[PDB]
Amino acid sequence: PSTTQARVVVDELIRGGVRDVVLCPGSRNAPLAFALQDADRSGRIRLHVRIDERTAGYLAIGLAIGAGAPVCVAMTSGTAVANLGPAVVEANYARVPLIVLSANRPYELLEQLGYFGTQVRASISLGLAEDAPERTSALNATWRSATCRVLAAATGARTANAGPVHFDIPLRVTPPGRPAGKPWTYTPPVTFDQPLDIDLSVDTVVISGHGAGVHPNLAALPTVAEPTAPRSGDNPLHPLALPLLRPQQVIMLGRPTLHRPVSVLLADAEVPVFALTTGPRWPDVSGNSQATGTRAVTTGAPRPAWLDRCAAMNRHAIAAVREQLAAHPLTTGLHVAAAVSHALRPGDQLVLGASNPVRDVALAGLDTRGIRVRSNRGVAGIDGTVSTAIGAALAYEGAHERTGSPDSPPRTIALIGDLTFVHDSSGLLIGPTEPIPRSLTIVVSNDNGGGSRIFGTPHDVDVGALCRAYHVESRQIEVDELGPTLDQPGAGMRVLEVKADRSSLRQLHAAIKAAL
Amino acid sequence: NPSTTQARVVVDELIRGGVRDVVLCPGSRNAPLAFALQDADRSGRIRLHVRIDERTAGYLAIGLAIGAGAPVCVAMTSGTAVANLGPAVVEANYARVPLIVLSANRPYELLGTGANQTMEQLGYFGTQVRASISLGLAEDAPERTSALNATWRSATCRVLAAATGARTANAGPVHFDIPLRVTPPGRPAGKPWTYTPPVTFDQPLDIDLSVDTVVISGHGAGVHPNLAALPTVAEPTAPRSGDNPLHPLALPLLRPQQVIMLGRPTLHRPVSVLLADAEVPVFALTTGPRWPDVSGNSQATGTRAVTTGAPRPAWLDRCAAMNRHAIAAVREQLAAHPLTTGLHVAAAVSHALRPGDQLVLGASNPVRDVALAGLDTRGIRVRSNRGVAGIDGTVSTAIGAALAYEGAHERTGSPDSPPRTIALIGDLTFVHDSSGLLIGPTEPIPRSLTIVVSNDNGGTPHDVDVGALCRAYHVESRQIEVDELGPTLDQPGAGMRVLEVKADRSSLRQLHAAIKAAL
Amino acid sequence: PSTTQARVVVDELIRGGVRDVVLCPGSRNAPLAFALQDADRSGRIRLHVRIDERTAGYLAIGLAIGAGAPVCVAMTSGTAVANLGPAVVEANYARVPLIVLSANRPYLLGQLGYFGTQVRASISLGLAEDAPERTSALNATWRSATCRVLAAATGARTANAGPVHFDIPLVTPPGRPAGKPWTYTPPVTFDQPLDIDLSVDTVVISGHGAGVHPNLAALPTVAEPTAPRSGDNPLHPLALPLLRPQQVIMLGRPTLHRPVSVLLADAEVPVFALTTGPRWPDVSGNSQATGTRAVTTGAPRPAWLDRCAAMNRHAIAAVREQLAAHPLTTGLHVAAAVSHALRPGDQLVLGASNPVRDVALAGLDTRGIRVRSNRGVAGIDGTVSTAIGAALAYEGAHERTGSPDSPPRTIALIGDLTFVHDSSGLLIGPTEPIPRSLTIVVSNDNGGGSRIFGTPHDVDVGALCRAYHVESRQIEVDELGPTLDQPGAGMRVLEVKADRSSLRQLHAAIKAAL
């Protein structure tokens, strides 16, 4: 009955592309849980159990963005809906395929908040398990057809806009699917196409933010790329050089969210802005977005005096940051961010906390080509980054495992503030039988704050003892140790603490601004 | 004045966005937008329609949107006025109609304070609406007049790009709430503040036409030249891709190995009966992100199909024979039937149709009765509220579609008579939406509208002088026999007229059983 | 099967006080349609069917406010929820016990957003499990849940009545003896006292949903029509600008009359809001305090009482004289005529635009008569069917008195725009109940307080009633009183044409005469 339909949707979930499922122990959602662990024992899926329902949501977000695959979370309590709120809100604004699973009880009379209405791509409730053995083969099709609907809506198969989905199974040999493990209803990924005429030769600077696509025809133009954005060309432009120049056009890739000059440039009424997104949503600053497109058709090529003015200032800004950082006495988050950037090698995965770390890496001018950079930029919360990295590693390392290469699994390196660490410190607690990453190292830049009693809050938390209590490898190191100790393999998961200073950081940026 | 500057700006961008008609319902909080709309109508930039009842006003907008294809905006005040658009918004959702509900509201600061005519307005429609966008309360800040304009125009384009499906390929209703307590110019050349070019959603799919395949064309289906030769059971509101029709009654008598499902087929229990048959694979080809669960065995979904081979000529001859067999059963029993029924009048209307006409059907019986008579849709624009298939607003939707089709013809510049718009509705739907006939003297009236009502008890009792209704709203009405329908429809008359045909609902079961028995 | 659940759910409604259920035919069969038919045939409930879903909801509102009992609406279509919106919003803002019935089938899923904002509670019964042994306890939970719906609808525990959504998913088990409800919940006594000094010059503004306060009977009170009067010292609304009250007592939820809002929004006048429910209104946040009753200190200054009564008389005369001096027949004249024709025990239903204001200007005395208006949202829709429902519930309660005297007449004064809005509500099948003493007075003027501001429609109201087989007469104002006394059909209308052009001149004369 109920268990027959639990096993069938799990088979179709795997067929649809689901590889990892997150789960919290609770009273409800027992039959679906058993069908999951049946598949986890077999090895068709990998199961992850956590106590904290909040961090499980972010863990699922990590598993999703790690390999770009749909990930499920199993709700088993009345607290789970509220706790998964933060993760579901991120998955909505970051377009992360997150399938939230529930088991409502329909034979009882008549909790849930209203964010499910605003955040979720589709709230789909399956039918009740029926005692109609003659019709079960007919009930199979709808169960597998409905499961394809939540998979298509989560991955944005027809909308080109991935996001979270609410899947509800009511609760009072398995029927086979199609041959060759194919999904019941196969919908190929849609190609969302919308061209836009753009005269390249006009002085153009390209701002690529979160969710940005790659356009090879824009590879030559000078581009200010956020860490999370992929890079189409090899002509970088530092974010701090932007005020020095006065562009006449701006191509906007995705959802840029960083840097005060970017906000003012896109808001300038005299400068027209063209936004190129991969999904139906398009951003605007002060309503200055002039046109929206999937891609741009390009007429001409920019004049090299523009090209060389930008390229010179780009070197001017990068040198000013590199020079002024060396001049500074104490180690700061910008120094720590620069330390991680120099120590990175292609094939790595980089996870950044959504506060200062992502900002600082851009200031350090990190080159991201060959690197996969992940950050919870949809809502920009300081929550759940520890679990996001753990999940990102587990999804990334799992791809290498299936890849079959006999290589050391790629490193996953995370950079988070102390406030981010303490928030999600509970994400470090993992059961012995639950999957644990093999090459994850979380750099914690402790500055006792982020960016006098309220603005910055001191906590005096012993990060080392906290890591010790959860049975994870920790080591307090100085800046120069980072690059060396990152290369040296240790435990599969380790936390590297680096002390930092805030008082000196304020003057440092003034010195950076004075050398420009 | 902030409220008037806001109103005149969002009206300008809506006009720039392709809004040619605007339905308006007057009230206290409606003033700033009502003035802005009047200056746009008096200047000839839009054609405004004032209606008294908001519910039928929303349906008047649906017709204006489907008759030409442009986004239509409606304006009303706070309170029960916006609630009256529930039924219209619900229909626009399932029918993908670019309806911009523009509501004036007392400031949100007053919500919960007990102020008269205020309610939980924003989000009233919930998930039925494509997007609920709220304009900021226009603040007294002339130092930012150049900045407030950009955000106002940028937001209006979002309302327009959402209602028309400019980037989602999924049109539908949008809730635009504006609280209220030289006009700043837009872009040069009259272009939208934020331009959105034509979008394409593409999902090709390998389909083998050699396999015995039938096509089921539903509401909102696209035209696919690859499938023009296949036998298609096409609903009236579905555009026909070819000249190989298949009657729906013929579908159960055939054995297809394959079925292509265009749009959203709703009609016909046999279609639903066949869709559940698992052995036959189903291929759903839609135009937008939505695709129907009417079949549980849907193998795959897409936007278009790439074909391999061609259907066997034996298969084509089999279906054509069955199609002719089903039409003959309908013809023979209808002629053999002594009395005149709702199917009789439905067959008469279809025969009097000529290419270039616009057919508007009551969503319950007429659509079924027209498809059973097997009307040829080619060259004819068939409109019906098939989103929710409610009895509401059929009259107003025919009126708007007439006004939209006629006005679109006047823009062609061709110097001939405006094309006919004739509608077929039952008495029950007619008496319900009788409020829609009421058009003010200054408001646009259709030039060639003929509402054909097929009166019978029901279709529980009601006895109603249909002529007295039309007299109450000053609409010319004559009562006709079934055989005189064609000639009267052929002879043009007033700009808007009603033709009532008395029909009998008793023998409907006797007639239907004969057709099923004649197969 | 599920019919046993349906049979007991209706039984608890009848036990709880439901006496009228409104129904519409639709796409899927009605929730508990069979159980209602038998109760209708047995005479335990009266049943009204309608084709228009929007009219049906407003009809139920009248059925609820006519006598004060909860009323159910059973709706069975995809357009059903959208069409009840306006009536449900009105029920919420007027605190009307309206129950809405649903029957969702939970064996696949995936309704507007107003249901969360408007209904006092949303309860769905458990699906009827097919098990005979546990039906003893299953009867109890069924009847426990139906009482919850009733208690939420009538505000039995919350003192705030309103709309409720009840969903029943798809011999009879007995209730408690003596036909009493399963879960007995008595009407709660919501109490909140407030110290008010009556020595200070105080005026009382009583609006929709106000309560009666005998200790406040002495004060001069500007009372809306739908407000119950608690004293014999009235004060015309047009005397308010000529007075300087140092205190204002706000009974209920006032809406009408510009001067009250100016006085209620005065920063320098303390406003004490006395309500019968948890909600309280404010105008520009000037409500210094809230309560349910007043504990009084002192008495009003006789000079203050003198002046108030003096200005009340002066305002009474100004409108009566300018009404007479004015040549043409305005909407104020028909409103004044209807007011003079009323007799104690009558029921009056007022359209939400000018009629509810105009009868207030004519100085109507509501003592002894029951006044009704859809003031929660002040909507122009559903007025004729609200009157129909009010007349039906009113006559039914009078019929339950058993008295031999003729049923009390229900009179309704509505504008033309409100008439054509709800014209469809007139079509009532012979199968359905029809009022016996309902009289509808239509003040026709092609709009009321210019292509947009006023909508000229030029409708034949006589031909429209002819169409719906309703008795109609186009009389004059002088003859309104006599025709109104002489009884006619159970449902009859009287259309009196009125001019809007002379209105600006007439109101100016009253301003000049004040």
Ligand SMILES: O=C(O)c1cc(O)c2ccccc2c1O
């Ligand atoms: O392109 C993206 O990835 C993207 C993602 C989002 O979550 C957005 C939310 C609001 C507006 C625009 C958005 C957007 O362009």
Ligand SMILES: O=C(O)c1cc(O)c2ccccc2c1O
């Ligand atoms: O493509 C369409 O026209 C269309 C439109 C809709 O509103 C639908 C609603 C539910 C299910 C399928 C739908 C569909 O296929």
Ligand SMILES: O=C(O)c1cc(O)c2ccccc2c1O
């Ligand atoms: O007492 C009433 O009738 C009543 C009714 C309402 O709907 C209110 C809404 C907001 C604030 C006060 C309210 C109020 O006092």
